[PDB]
Design a protein around this ligand. Structure first.
Ligand code: NA
Length: 330
């Protein structure tokens, strides 16, 4: 089997992407944030504290003929941005882009933090990291990908995120029409539960490529590119008037600037992030200070190849016995 679903930016900045997901019988369609940096499929629900719901579509298990309580199971998750959610668990039928899994753990939120409530466009998360990170207790649950894997034509999924435009998540096949050139595959460590890999270096604009190992994670649920402070300083040094602002919480730059590209290495191959992808717009409405899309990972404890980086590539998440990542230009 295969599946193919369109993913759509939630706003004009590409802050996140939402993908429609069918849950239950008859189908309830919720727009979920597919997150290769976490491993829980959780939704706003009929159980979510009413004051914490503001415009989201909810899953109502009592209206699904295939829902069953996973008795005694609870979940609770905290993300890198400080957000959190928790609740109980149902199993139900879940379909993505025509690919169906029966018996998927659907984590129903009883509580969500303010950042979730405030984002009316995201109805929950669908985790695509390794199932070792799933938070369900006392019986850890599998991701949608892990439950689908054995049925798929190939044990893979791909992320093809758009810049200010829709893109695609495919399951079970490579769309050879969706990228240019060849796919370069690179090793993955699953030791922290992430799609963790080592980039071979970077370049800023038309500058020379610096060969250096940068360990980090491929994380579709993170907006920005978080890299070591040395790398990030070298990038922003090429933008007149850019500075790190402790008050704003990262590098800012004059909205009048034209940003340089940023290249990262994948083995001997190179992915180029256009400068425009690194502009996250005014820090507050009407400001002439703009927020940068490349930020320091110092204090986060891991480098993160978030959407800024991934949307410059066609990315293969290869879930074979030995997982690997692939990157192609597009
Ligand atoms: Na921000």
């Amino acid at each position: 089997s295969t599946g193919s679903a369109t993913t759509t930016p939630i706003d004009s900045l590409d802050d996140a992407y939402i993908t429609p997901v069918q849950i239950g019988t008859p189908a309830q369609t919720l727009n979920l944030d597919f997150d290769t940096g976490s491993s829980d499929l959780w939704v706003f629900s009929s159980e979510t504290t009413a004051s914490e719901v503001d415009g989201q579509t909810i899953y109502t298990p009592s209206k699904s003929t295939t829902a069953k309580l996973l008795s005694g199971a609870t979940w609770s998750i905290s993300y890198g941005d400080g957000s959190s959610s928790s609740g109980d668990v149902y199993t139900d039928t879940v379909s993505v882009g025509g690919l169906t899994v029966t018996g998927q753990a659907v984590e129903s939120a009883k509580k969500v933090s303010s950042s979730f409530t405030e984002d009316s466009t995201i109805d929950g998360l669908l985790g695509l990291a390794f199932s070792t990170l799933n938070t369900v207790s006392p019986t850890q649950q599998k991701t949608f990908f892990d439950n689908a894997k054995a049925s798929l034509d190939s044990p893979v999924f791909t992320a093809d995120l758009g810049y200010h435009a829709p893109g695609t998540y495919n399951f079970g096949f490579i769309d050879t029409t969706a990228y240019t050139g060849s796919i370069t595959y690179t090793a993955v460590s699953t030791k922290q539960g992430f799609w963790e890999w080592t980039s071979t270096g970077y370049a800023v604009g038309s500058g020379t490529f610096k060969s250096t190992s940068i360990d980090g994670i491929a994380d579709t649920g993170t907006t920005l590119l978080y890299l070591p402070a040395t790398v990030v300083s070298a990038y922003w040094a090429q933008v007149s008037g850019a500075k790190s602002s402790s008050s704003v919480g990262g590098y800012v730059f004059p909205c009048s600037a034209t940003l340089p590209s940023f290249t990262f290495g994948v083995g001997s191959a190179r992915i180029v992030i256009p400068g425009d992808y690194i502009d996250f717009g005014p820090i507050s409405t009407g400001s002439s200070s703009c927020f940068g899309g490349i930020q320091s990972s110092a204090g986060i404890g891991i480098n993160i190849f978030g959407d800024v980086a991934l949307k410059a590539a066609f990315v293969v998440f290869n879930g074979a016995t030995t997982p690997t990542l692939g990157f192609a230009s597009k």
